[PDB]
Swiss-Prot record:
It is found in: Nucleus; Chromosome. Acetylated by KAT8 in epithelial but not in mesenchymal cells, thereby regulating the epithelial-to-mesenchymal transition. Acetylation by KAT8 reduces KDM1A association with nucleosomes, thereby decreasing histone H3 demethylation, leading to transcription activatio of target genes. Polyubiquitinated by JADE2; which leads to its proteasomal degradation. Deubiquitinated by USP38; preventing it from degradation by the 26S proteasome. Component of a histone demethylase complex with RCOR1. Component of a RCOR/GFI/KDM1A/HDAC complex. Interacts directly with GFI1 and GFI1B. Interacts with INSM1 (via N-terminus). Component of a BHC histone deacetylase complex that contains HDAC1, HDAC2, HMG20B, KDM1A, RCOR1 and PHF21A. The BHC complex may also contain ZMYM2, ZNF217, ZMYM3, GSE1 and GTF2I. In the complex, RCOR1/CoREST strongly enhances the demethylase activity and protects it from the proteasome while PHF21A/BHC80 inhibits the demethylase activity. Interacts with the androgen receptor (AR). Ubiquitously expressed. This is Lysine-specific histone demethylase 1A. It comes from the Eukaryota. The lineage of its organism: Eukaryota, Metazoa, Chordata, Craniata, Vertebrata. Changing residue 82 to R: In AIMAH3; uncertain significance. Residues 5-89 form the SWIRM domain. Induction: Down-regulated during neural differentiation in neuroblastoma cancer. The SWIRM domain may act as an anchor site for a histone tail. Histone demethylase that can demethylate both 'Lys-4' (H3K4me) and 'Lys-9' (H3K9me) of histone H3, thereby acting as a coactivator or a corepressor, depending on the context. Acts by oxidizing the substrate by FAD to generate the corresponding imine that is subsequently hydrolyzed. Acts as a corepressor by mediating demethylation of H3K4me, a specific tag for epigenetic transcriptional activation. Demethylates both mono- (H3K4me1) and di-methylated (H3K4me2) H3K4me. May play a role in the repression of neuronal genes. It is linked to Cleft palate, psychomotor retardation, and distinctive facial features: A syndrome characterized by cleft palate, developmental delay, psychomotor retardation, and facial dysmorphic features including a prominent forehead, slightly arched eyebrows, elongated palpebral fissures, a wide nasal bridge, thin lips, and widely spaced teeth. Cleft palate is a congenital fissure of the soft and/or hard palate, due to faulty fusion. ACTH-independent macronodular adrenal hyperplasia 3: A form of macronodular adrenal hyperplasia, a rare adrenal defect characterized by multiple, bilateral, non-pigmented, benign, adrenocortical nodules. It results in excessive production of cortisol leading to ACTH-independent Cushing syndrome. Clinical manifestations of Cushing syndrome include facial and truncal obesity, abdominal striae, muscular weakness, osteoporosis, arterial hypertension, diabetes. AIMAH3 affected individuals have low fasting cortisol and ACTH, but excess cortisol is secreted after eating.
Amino acid sequence: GPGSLPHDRMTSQEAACFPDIISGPQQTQKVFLFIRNRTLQLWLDNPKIQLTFEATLQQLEAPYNSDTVLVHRVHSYLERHGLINFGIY
């Protein structure tokens, strides 16, 4: 339901892949959440073509585009778990 993937809280599936983030300072949790939310919004605005890591990074404003390792992790997590890029190859 509405609680499953809220904009303002990390989930347990995310916790398994980001234990360092969910355990850590709140402001870095907010960075994670912004990246996740924007990546999903980019995908769902155009779910008929592949959303790549590079395209995501180019569409994130500063300062979110600065931590390229974190953006890559979020994008990889979302794609590997099927939340982006289903059916578009």
